[PDB]
């Protein structure tokens, strides 16, 4: 199903992250123009959030169980 996408998608992930270790929803949706709703249940089960100064919001691929590299 939309699990093309996840997989593809996930490899826009790791050359956004090689650029940095944090993004927020903002720039995820320029690299993919994908419904955030998709993008935000991929970062849910390996990604995380995090908010700060201004409430920034940033999220980061949980490396804690990537078997995959």
Do not use: C
Not at 6 to 19: C, G, I, N, P, Y
Not at 45 to 50: L, S, T, Y
Request: hydrophobic share 35%.
């Amino acid at each position: 199903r939309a699990r093309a996408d996840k997989q593809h998608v996930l490899d826009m992930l790791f050359s956004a992250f090689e650029k940095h270790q944090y993004y927020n929803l903002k720039d995820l949706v320029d690299i993919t123009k994908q419904p955030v709703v998709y993008l935000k249940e991929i970062l849910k089960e390996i990604g995380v959030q995090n908010v700060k100064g201004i409430h920034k919001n940033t999220w980061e691929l949980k490396p804690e169980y990537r078997h995959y590299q």
